Amino acid sequence: SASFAPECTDLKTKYDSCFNEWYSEKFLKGKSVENECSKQWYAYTTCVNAALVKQGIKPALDEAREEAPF
């Protein structure tokens, strides 16, 4: 499963793997709400945001993130 920015893909995988364990084994079992994946998350999201800055879509994404569909 690739990131839209290829330099972020291996970082995404590591974050996704950590989240997947946390989600199944902790969140759904009501055993945690802490960010136990913060290391993998902040590394990944740093790589993504650096990439998004140069992306034409960024303003449309920023707007979309303010809306509340639910």
Binding site: D16, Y23, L28, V48, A60, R65, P69, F70
Partner: protein, 170 residues
Amino acid sequence: MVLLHKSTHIFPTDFASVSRAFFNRYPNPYSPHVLSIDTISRNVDQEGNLRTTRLLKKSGKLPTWVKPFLRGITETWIIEVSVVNPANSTMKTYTRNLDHTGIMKVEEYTTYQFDSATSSTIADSRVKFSSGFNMGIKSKVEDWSRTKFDENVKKSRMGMAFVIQKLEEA
């Protein structure tokens, strides 16, 4: 013009399997046009619900008849917003295209709800197609919308079923 479509599907497995499948749906062989997906934000909120925004890139192609009206569109960005409520076993999801919205906006709400009396997760979908840019002839755009809705209904549920399986088989 606004066109609303609806569908329902039942997955005969538990909430944890469906909601996990949703977060891990890509890649699968039923969605070959999804080039990438990224998580943009994720946090647990005030009420203990999981809030996730993701960004997908998808390739595509316009039908030939729209050639004199529309230029070549071959890629689209899609936002995907979801809320998981573990106390209720509910997952709400929303998607829409981020670009080409002046030509056509396609919005989808899909809710996954576990029903314990039947030990199944029911998926209700509603999809709205909206456009104020009238290109081309209305009934052909409508046909396109029905075709697209039906294709997505099947791709979505086949992909989900594929991934639920693969995770079941470890």
